[PDB]
Design a protein around this ligand. Sequence first.
Ligand SMILES: Cc1cc2nc3c(=O)[nH]c(=O)nc-3n(C[C@H](O)[C@H](O)[C@H](O)COP(=O)(O)OP(=O)(O)OC[C@H]3O[C@@H](n4cnc5c(N)ncnc54)[C@H](O)[C@@H]3O)c2cc1C
Ligand SMILES: Cc1cc2nc3c(=O)[nH]c(=O)nc-3n(C[C@H](O)[C@H](O)[C@H](O)COP(=O)(O)OP(=O)(O)OC[C@H]3O[C@@H](n4cnc5c(N)ncnc54)[C@H](O)[C@@H]3O)c2cc1C
Ligand SMILES: Cc1cc2nc3c(=O)[nH]c(=O)nc-3n(C[C@H](O)[C@H](O)[C@H](O)COP(=O)(O)OP(=O)(O)OC[C@H]3O[C@@H](n4cnc5c(N)ncnc54)[C@H](O)[C@@H]3O)c2cc1C
Ligand SMILES: CC(=O)c1sc(CCOP(=O)(O)OP(=O)(O)O)c(C)[n+]1Cc1cnc(C)nc1N
Ligand SMILES: CC(=O)c1sc(CCOP(=O)(O)OP(=O)(O)O)c(C)[n+]1Cc1cnc(C)nc1N
Ligand SMILES: CC(=O)c1sc(CCOP(=O)(O)OP(=O)(O)O)c(C)[n+]1Cc1cnc(C)nc1N
Ligand SMILES: [Mg+2]
Ligand SMILES: [Mg+2]
Ligand SMILES: [Mg+2]
Ligand code: NA
Ligand code: NA
Lengths: 585, 585, 585
Amino acid sequence: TNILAGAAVIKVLEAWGVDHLYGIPGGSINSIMDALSAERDRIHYIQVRHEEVGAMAAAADAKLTGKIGVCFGSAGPGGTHLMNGLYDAREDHVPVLALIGQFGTTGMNMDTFQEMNENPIYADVADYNVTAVNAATLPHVIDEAIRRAYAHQGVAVVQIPVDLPWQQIPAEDWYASANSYQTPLLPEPDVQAVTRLTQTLLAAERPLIYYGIGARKAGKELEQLSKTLKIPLMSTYPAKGIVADRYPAYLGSANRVAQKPANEALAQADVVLFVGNNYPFAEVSKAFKNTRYFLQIDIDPAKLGKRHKTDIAVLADAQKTLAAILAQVSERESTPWWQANLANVKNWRAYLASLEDKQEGPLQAYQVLRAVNKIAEPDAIYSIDVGDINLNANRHLKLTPSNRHITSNLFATMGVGIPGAIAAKLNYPERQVFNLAGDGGASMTMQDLATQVQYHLPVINVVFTNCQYGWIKDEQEDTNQNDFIGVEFNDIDFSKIADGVHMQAFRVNKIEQLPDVFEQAKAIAQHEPVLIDAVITGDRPLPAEKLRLDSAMSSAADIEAFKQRYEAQDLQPLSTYLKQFGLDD
Amino acid sequence: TNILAGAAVIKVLEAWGVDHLYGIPGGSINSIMDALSAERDRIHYIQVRHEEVGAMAAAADAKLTGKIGVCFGSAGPGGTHLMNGLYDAREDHVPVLALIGQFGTTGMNMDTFQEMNENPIYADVADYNVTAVNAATLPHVIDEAIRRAYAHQGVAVVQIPVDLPWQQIPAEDWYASANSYQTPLLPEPDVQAVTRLTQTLLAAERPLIYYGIGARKAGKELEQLSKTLKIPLMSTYPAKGIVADRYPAYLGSANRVAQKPANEALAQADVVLFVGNNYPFAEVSKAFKNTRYFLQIDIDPAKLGKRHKTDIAVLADAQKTLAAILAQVSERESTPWWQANLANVKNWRAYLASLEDKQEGPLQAYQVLRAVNKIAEPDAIYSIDVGDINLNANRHLKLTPSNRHITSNLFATMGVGIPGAIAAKLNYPERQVFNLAGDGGASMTMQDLATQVQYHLPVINVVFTNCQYGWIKDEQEDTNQNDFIGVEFNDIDFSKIADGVHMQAFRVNKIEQLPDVFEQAKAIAQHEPVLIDAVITGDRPLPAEKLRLDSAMSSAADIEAFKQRYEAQDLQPLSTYLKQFGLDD
Amino acid sequence: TNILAGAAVIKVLEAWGVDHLYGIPGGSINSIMDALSAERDRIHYIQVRHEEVGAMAAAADAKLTGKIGVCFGSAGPGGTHLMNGLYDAREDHVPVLALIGQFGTTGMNMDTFQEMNENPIYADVADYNVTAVNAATLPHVIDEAIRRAYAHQGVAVVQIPVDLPWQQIPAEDWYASANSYQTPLLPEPDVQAVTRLTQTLLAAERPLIYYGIGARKAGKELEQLSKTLKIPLMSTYPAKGIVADRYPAYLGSANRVAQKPANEALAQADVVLFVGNNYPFAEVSKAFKNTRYFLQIDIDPAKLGKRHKTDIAVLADAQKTLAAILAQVSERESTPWWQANLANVKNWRAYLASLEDKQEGPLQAYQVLRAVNKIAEPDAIYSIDVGDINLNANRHLKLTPSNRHITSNLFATMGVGIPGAIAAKLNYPERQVFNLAGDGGASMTMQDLATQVQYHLPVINVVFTNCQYGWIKDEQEDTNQNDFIGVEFNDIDFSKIADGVHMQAFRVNKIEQLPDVFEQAKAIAQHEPVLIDAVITGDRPLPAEKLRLDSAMSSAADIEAFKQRYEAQDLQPLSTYLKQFGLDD
Ligand SMILES: Cc1cc2nc3c(=O)[nH]c(=O)nc-3n(C[C@H](O)[C@H](O)[C@H](O)COP(=O)(O)OP(=O)(O)OC[C@H]3O[C@@H](n4cnc5c(N)ncnc54)[C@H](O)[C@@H]3O)c2cc1C
Ligand SMILES: Cc1cc2nc3c(=O)[nH]c(=O)nc-3n(C[C@H](O)[C@H](O)[C@H](O)COP(=O)(O)OP(=O)(O)OC[C@H]3O[C@@H](n4cnc5c(N)ncnc54)[C@H](O)[C@@H]3O)c2cc1C
Ligand SMILES: Cc1cc2nc3c(=O)[nH]c(=O)nc-3n(C[C@H](O)[C@H](O)[C@H](O)COP(=O)(O)OP(=O)(O)OC[C@H]3O[C@@H](n4cnc5c(N)ncnc54)[C@H](O)[C@@H]3O)c2cc1C
Ligand SMILES: CC(=O)c1sc(CCOP(=O)(O)OP(=O)(O)O)c(C)[n+]1Cc1cnc(C)nc1N
Ligand SMILES: CC(=O)c1sc(CCOP(=O)(O)OP(=O)(O)O)c(C)[n+]1Cc1cnc(C)nc1N
Ligand SMILES: CC(=O)c1sc(CCOP(=O)(O)OP(=O)(O)O)c(C)[n+]1Cc1cnc(C)nc1N
Ligand SMILES: [Mg+2]
Ligand SMILES: [Mg+2]
Ligand SMILES: [Mg+2]
Ligand code: NA
Ligand code: NA
């Protein structure tokens, strides 16, 4: 006859298939806690040590599975702690439900303890942002929040006065709309548009296909188009792994979390096929300033001709359109453009291999990542924090379609490594999970290493300890007139942090220590989380956006300095390969 | 002839006497970093490990000194990390300037990396909230922000596109208005109002003076009025210390961070003088429902008759008005009301002493606080986190006018213990500083123990490890139908956390360990920070808002249970003393 | 080599096919005005007399053509005057671009004249809401705003510091992405789901098809499905006209802007096919409380299961789905349900005809609408204000697929009659255009009758002068305990208002005066606007939501009073027809 409104809210979550949710309790959210407590069998509550980790792990759930992530915070400071996770979900356009505690309706607007108007707090981050005021409609408001988060690929926020979830409502009135949920059946792209686009791509002398994560289902088509047509591939950093890194004509990504061949080739390309791509550096870096024809495939009308004046923009699914292109083309013989790029890639990979293959001496990030590679399972998931690690992981990890990797792509909040890995292990208990974090980002969320312990989540945490905000030190070196400030700091020993949260850990500072430590960690992570604190050097990684290798573009002094600093003596500029196969710039 | 707009901004900060500021650098704020770097001698930059600690320490600066606190965060996630500190400053009504990084004006609104419209983020927390768009007026905007933060006692926020602080502006144009800054000369309260108010207070049979921190300058007048007129004193929790805790007619505070005599007496009072007080539980707890006459002294017109229907509300300075009352009254003989309260206080203090004076056995919070008392200097400053520690510190610390104590009073964000203590030691290098934190709150900001080490801030950190959100577990016990959830969790060993950040530390779990550990910590904190991790029991502290001691109000079974749980066998209800001196309820 | 940024911005509007735009100039928007002035041969500026009319007309443009509407207002009060039209655009989900004046960047944040942080003002209404800060990127920010407004079907607001449009930018860098524009892809109906839906619909004893404007392309299919399957049709009020009103099994709309047969049939229906419909009354009115099965077709996943739990939900285009149902069914025999409804419709229309067909006496709204019908061209466009006119026009206008009618559907802002008619005449100079408005709503925007005169826009304005807010008077009658207040007021002679703005006009107060006045108006509007001020009675129109005709449900006294008041002696309840064909109510 009656049901507690709170019990009904949990039944809405269960109807939408929410497996786990994150938060920290408080008096202002104890009636939702009370309903969760009764439903421990069907929905798994994960108590975090800081609510931002809950919000970031919710976003990561959605990044990994496509299913809505769920978090909560108590009134006032519980909810405002969510913000870095919620902005991450907004900017990374993944569905997240955030519940916010509120004082009961009898005390709202009385200026009582921790009581404020919480609605304006969430207005900017949230696609849907409402304070519930009635128990009977509360299940519907939760259902509405979820349906909107999914439909609009963003954050829904609901402030809940704590009295409402303890009120009885009729048992037969509330429902969830999870049963109506479906994915659309999209039309095929028009043959005429696809044909026009194909002719332009094929007529190019120096073509590139430049994809982002909108092409995540088109890995097969991308690689086969490349091989058949002899057109090199480049991607956004997040799109790494869609085509295996092994692929000899994968150039990497452009800009700064970037690889030399992609930046060089992009500068030379006459035609770019830009697919499922919203590259944020397009305009500011003038990436397409020498491009003759810009062709686009995107599913979102908001993106059409967004990043560059577009000759042909096809509104369509990436995979369907790329498959449709593939169906109308056939073999082209190897071209000088193709051979020049292959040779350029080869030269670049040998450079990266020479960094990895050092056997003895002062530990660098490069050998640490090689050691990750050596213990990694073919379907490992990598949760990656924010800083030099993005650049290093982008160059060194050897990813294929079986892997996943996530970071905070656009909002780029430090601290995501720990919660991303928590979410990954909760969704995929049988898959190996890494957290690769710099010392700055790891220190921001370090308390939640305890959450991995408490819930027995066998994450392999690898902390890169340079005692710097390395990413920012290098920026200051490029722009700042005065001395470094705020970017070099005191050591934290993360093996001791790990010990404090009752997690097994190692600290290493020499290349020769890696094989045995990483072997131990692999084994430990069969049952329990582990941490490796890698004390690395302060060497600046090669800046792919500031290459000094080409005699025609840089002074001989500039080149010798760059080669020295970046151990880059055997790197050749793309122009060398262009000339080799009989082409100019 | 010219000056960098950034250099001028720092000169504005220096003109307003800003000694130190907190933040973490990023590319979007590196031009402000560049100006700070050149001015290291005259303004001290404190690099924190999480920007919320910077914001909380800025609020604490203002809490302690009355001078504007200053913090910053880089664009996107740097600034959103500030939020718990900024809401704390808003709710605690202290002046704070927050600078937010932004992408340069040429890339704003281009949807580039970490670039968004940041202005709506800060609209709710901030009294003044603006995006700067011109270098020439930037010093003025900073000056305007400061002047407004001070005038309105809140948060000013300025988003700064990173190009502006590197632009040249005329050297002679910009100025600071720090030279115009003054405190008002207030009138005296009218004699007639003071007289009317005094007659009503004196005619009462059961008077109380109930002050908050608006009476911080009136400690002397408060205690002398009490002694002369025989009127007991009670305060808000934050107003503890304004009159020495030793004072025999100080009752303590009401509600939950509360002491038994204050709650009991308040329930009996016929007349309350409510001074410099904005007690947020007034209405929700029906604190004044049996009060006959409610008299008020406040400096803010917004507060007049806010918390209860007010018979006489004098708009005036607390000290001036209390001194004016004192000047028109003289000695009254001891009354039964006075003696009953004194006896009630005595009984309560013996109870607290019996908890503190245990010498051997399972460690409780009570003996930990006695150990703090034993090593505390008479002018020590206490930065207090949020949870059971507020209740325990309120009962046990032996404070006088020479002390300071701060917490997050109204927003009540956990994690403030560490940053409050950092700010306290930076403002008062020669004064002993404690951070008293529960394990939940300490774990939220633990990474910034490293900041105390880096800057050689000899804080005494005392962590109360119950492996619970104790405050919330007890709430769940009171309200929740189903089992405890989210409030009991795994151990973190903070002596090992401290070791990881290179801070000397101890862990204790037995009463008999306290004297030697606290003696060592006292000595260590002559030169370096120290941490004591006190593993305490899960005993619930006596709930002053749920007393079961009075035969006329509770069942004999209820009383025996309460006496047993709370080691309260020798506590008597106020009514016993009322009857003793010949009064009824 | 260079172009003024303001010139480039107008070229972006031209590239996007903007024909006309509305607003009022000011110092803060004079550089956009300057650019507009040079471009007066290619884009047409419409000067309004109040900025809300500009914003409202921009919304109506989009409602009519699907082309983004464009309006502007100067800094401060110019922009805030836009709100009612911008909220109208958000709630009716149509693309509008709003440009807001702002002081130059050298004066922003100086607290100068009409200068303020304008961004927070538009945060709630806008899908995209930015302050421009750079001249070179300004064309892109405008291009971005338009593309988002279109993609997201809502409002984009750009605040423009007045200096930027007067700055020179490189002539060759800016572009518009209008060439790349596409409308979102239409999802396809699953064949098996459509088959399941059809079987449930065909098994129904009492089926209804209940469509909204999502089905505006499916009129042919709606009507043919109805005839073939013997299933009555009902619609939301805005969907009136998608199926010709003369169609015998069109019941009308439900709730209050409603027709008796729709409300009665919906109460009895066992199965509802709810298609392209977001009826906001569904839950609050319990429309579907006794519906056994609910079948939904909608393009938007956010709507699926929103208004009732679905038994079958199809995420697909309305016309494709309905075509697919029709393609798999054949002629059904008549059923008792079908006959009962057809007879109820005939009885209802005879009632409305009886009101329209009065030939002399005190003028009522019904005869005015009949006189509109008599002069209306088959493809007339109706801009309808808000109040009793929505209910009356819903019952009396005889519309077909050749007509258009618009109002403020959901925000339901009064005053839209005038601007909507202005926009209608601008987009369709060869079609007859009516503005049908109550005296309350016409009053709000009356000054912009001068805009119809100024631009020679031959609108037929008809004002229904009851000297009341009748819609609200009736609500007060229904709910209020004390006397009417604020709902009856002094006369305004709109024929004199019209005379004042130099528009030909008539005032009538008798039924017999209509034929000749309407003939004259019809003729005048071949070349110039005209106004008819119809002084009507204070008769309440029949409340379709409060029927008192069924003796099984209402007393004799209530039935008699209802018939007498609403001249409804000859109306029968649906149960009469249900019983005739052997079905119990
Ligand atoms: C420290 C740091 C530095 C960074 N710097 C770089 C850098 O130097 N280089 C770099 O490349 N990245 C960098 N990034 C990542 C970067 O900010 C952007 O997030 C990224 O480049 C955008 O990738 P995307 O276009 O794949 O993803 P998104 O921005 O998510 O875009 C996906 C696109 O695909 C479309 N789409 C989605 N589904 C489909 C479909 N089915 N069919 C067709 N289209 C579809 C979407 O509409 C959208 O346009 C960095 C990240 C960090 C943390
Ligand atoms: C976990 C937790 C629990 C808490 N629960 C309790 C509790 O149970 N009991 C309790 O007492 N507190 C409690 N609080 C603290 C509480 O929330 C309020 O912050 C506090 O009671 C308000 O104290 P106040 O009135 O002294 O300060 P404020 O709210 O800052 O008010 C100061 C008042 O003095 C006025 N004023 C300022 N200057 C002058 C002047 N010169 N002359 C005259 N008037 C002036 C101001 O206008 C204002 O009205 C708790 C805090 C925490 C962290
Ligand atoms: C004074 C006043 C009183 C009113 N009261 C009433 C009233 O009593 N009764 C009444 O009916 N109305 C009333 N309204 C109008 C009412 O508020 C709503 O706007 C209306 O009922 C909703 O109509 P709709 O569903 O047709 O439009 P919308 O709310 O615009 O919904 C259209 C739906 O169609 C979907 N859609 C769009 N395109 C497609 C496609 N190609 N295929 C499939 N689906 C598609 C959309 O996703 C959306 O769900 C009143 C208006 C006024 C001004
Ligand atoms: C991208 C960005 O804005 C970066 S990268 C970075 C340095 C990360 O240091 P870490 O030690 O973790 O990595 P390292 O480079 O290997 O030393 C900072 C401070 N920021 C700015 C910043 C500031 N604060 C927060 C919460 N997030 C970000 N992204
Ligand atoms: C007051 C309030 O809302 C409290 S007190 C408290 C427990 C503190 O636990 P700790 O271990 O630090 O202390 P203990 O009681 O001694 O065990 C919580 C979670 N909350 C809610 C809450 C949640 N999250 C944050 C950031 N701040 C608050 N205040
Ligand atoms: C629906 C709604 O919210 C209505 S309908 C109505 C009365 C309309 O009076 P009018 O004389 O124009 O029409 P009449 O009924 O024919 O007398 C009002 C005041 N309101 C509230 C209201 C107030 N103000 C504005 C701008 N818009 C609305 N919708
Ligand atoms: Mg680092
Ligand atoms: Mg605790
Ligand atoms: Mg009217
Ligand atoms: Na932290
Ligand atoms: Na007006």
